[PDB]
Design a binder for this molecule. Sequence first.
Ligand SMILES: O=c1cc[nH]c(=O)[nH]1
Length: 223
Amino acid sequence: MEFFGESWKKHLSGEFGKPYFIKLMGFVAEERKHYTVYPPPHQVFTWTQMCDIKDVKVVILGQDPYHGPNQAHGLCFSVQRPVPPPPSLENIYKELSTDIEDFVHPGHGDLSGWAKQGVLLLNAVLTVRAHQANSHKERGWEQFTDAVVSWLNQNSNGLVFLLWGSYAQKKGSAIDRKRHHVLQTAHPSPLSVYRGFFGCRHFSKTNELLQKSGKKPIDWKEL
DNA sequence: TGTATCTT
DNA sequence: AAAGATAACA
Ligand SMILES: O=c1cc[nH]c(=O)[nH]1
């Protein structure tokens, strides 16, 4: 119980009774019986437990969870102490250090600090079979995360979406590019970071857009 | 050994 | 689809 934060469950509950969702949860359940799936069930929706849905100001959309033991916990790119930051996160910190002058490696990989500030740390696909990246794509997660993006698009204003990677970028078409700001770059994984993530300056750019629309910027060092 | 994106 | 090529790093 209580895997979903109250305000999130209230606005996404309409998906629960849909065939694709019932079949999606059915698939993940069958998978957990034969393989190790990440993150654990009680953490698949951690991204709804950090702030009220109406308080989201920035959305970071990744591809799918870390596929190693004890890494993924429901917030994209984040890992709970004492787990060391995986390759993707070390790259995010590397960019943050050159993008934000006051930013220095926090010495851990827990990104709850950002989420509590209204930064939704979402992935297009919310589960993954151990050691197999994007193994759970096209099973129904995409329509669910589409519902999340769609609600935010219609009920919020001036949000800043950071779509990292081709899969996250599939959601760009559902975002009113006039009402919200969409920043797109390569995924921070070592296998693609060199295609543009380094130098993208999305963190400083995100705050410029927020402050321009009179909103409090994100303190990226607040972790 | 191990962490995307484009092409056939 | 899904496998192969291409691709930084350590
Ligand atoms: O949560 C995560 C971690 C790495 N890469 C992603 O796309 N998401």
